[model samples]
Target: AQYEDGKQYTTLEKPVAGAPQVLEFFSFFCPHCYQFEEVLHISDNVKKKLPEGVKMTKYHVNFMGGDLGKDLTQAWAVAMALGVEDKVTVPLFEGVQKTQTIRSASDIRDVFINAGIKGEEYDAAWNSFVVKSLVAQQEKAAADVQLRGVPAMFVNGKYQLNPQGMDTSNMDVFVQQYADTVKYLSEK
Candidate 1:
């Protein structure tokens, strides 16, 4: 359930040192995840609020049903390959979450175009070894991990945030509890 050194969902050249790694487990088509995005995107503020060496990483947990999950995973792969993750992340999320446009690969490409990424650039990156490898890793995680919901949170490799366990549906509160849990566990 944990990633080995030299293998992680993100394309970091080195281990993320100092930043508390917050890995978000979400699906693009999940309405709950879409609603959850409103707060998760504010994690830049969360980063500012946390101790140094804390960073947020997003993992789009694919392999749910149909080909939607598969397609979303590919889109993420392309964005990561193009180094346009920052550029395409929001737009793609909006496409799936806010708007109902990104229902497939072609629609995902439209989101990419809106993000200022080109088709050729996306093609190159989508098929790059790095991106493909990472996407494979994501697919594996989807299969291996005991994923239960659209928006789950993991701290480092130890624990996950279960909304059902929290007894409420407020995404902001769920996220805050997740951060708190991370601090407590990591400090131990």
Candidate 2:
């Protein structure tokens, strides 16, 4: 739950791309990430309160899968292509972590269709060159950071927020501290 005691973040020797961005590398398969998004609401909380012009982004981690990892990432990128991530990500998490409804590719496709995306669009993006590369890029991005866990939040691709360093007893305090650190790093 914590990167280290009182260490907000460690600076990278060589900063990665995507500055001014709070990028989270996560996996729907990870329970900590599920709680981070659902119970704590850190993603939306931090996004809404971020400093002016700063943007929050996500890259789904494919390393946590039992072979279904890459398929899930495809679902994400395809949803992104079809403009349905807001409608898709949470449900997938709930399904994978709670309901156990997302067992295969068809299960993921059902969610996209439920999100008002047509099957044709889902299929197209699922196999599109654009989405193929997008999925590859996301996998590479996580590898670039050498991410070892879920709900890892990095600001400007340089500073990563330390979840353990902040007070986690109260949800509000935790999110605010995360947002504050993200704001600070966005300006850094």
How many residue pairs clash in all the candidates, one count each?
Answer: 5, 1
In model 2, residue pairs whose N, Cα or C atoms come closer than 3 Å (at least 3 residues apart or on different chains), thus clashing, are 2-164
TM-score of model 2 vs. true structure: 0.91
Model 2 is weakest, by summed lDDT over 10 consecutive residues, at: 1-10
Model 1 CA deviation exceeding 4 Å by range: 1-21, 39-42, 167-175
Off by over 4 Å in 2: 1-6, 17-20
lDDT of 1 by residue, 46-87 (tens): 455567766666667665646877878877877666677777
Task: Tell me the TM-score of each prediction against the true structure.
Answer: 0.73, 0.91
| Clash pairs detected, candidate 1 | 18-53, 19-53, 19-54, 20-53, 20-54
Score candidate 2 by lDDT: 0.80
lDDT, model 1 = 0.62
lDDT of 2 at 32: 86
